Amino acid sequence: DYIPEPMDLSLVDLPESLIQLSERIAENVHEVWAKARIDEGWTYGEKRDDIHKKHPCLVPYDELPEEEKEYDRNTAMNTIKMVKKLGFRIEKEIPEPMDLSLVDLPESLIQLSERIAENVHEVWAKARIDEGWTYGEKRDDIHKKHPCLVPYDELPEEEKEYDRNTAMNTIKMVKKLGFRIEKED
Q: Is residue 68 part of a domain?
């Protein structure tokens, strides 16, 4: 009965000087994900096992298949397209993450993390909903089942907290690269 309801982001007129740096934004997004999920004992594994704590993509960014780094580039850019979908302006001025903490973001955007975090889930769910996935209580790859195939308001808030700052660290990096971010009147 559930159908993801994300919006049309195509009309966003991002800067060209930002799309040329989608590599540096998707890169550390992997590293932040690589450091976080490696700090619980999970290690590299060609196959994936939740029990044995292994992951296929726990790699240096280049070791990821070109098909997936392409997706990580389009995952990140859609967030800043969403930030510009919220009436903002963007203009040019070892898993190793960066000290993006000092970056100051507008209060009128940090509030709107809910709209962005929801759409990232609704973007992520629509890909699996047309690749054959289905909502199950627990995960299985062969039968294509995943617990997070739920309406965003019904997701566990422990992962409703992960989506916002992940998308907003995808934004914290943008301003670290000198792309002004401010509300539009």
A: yes
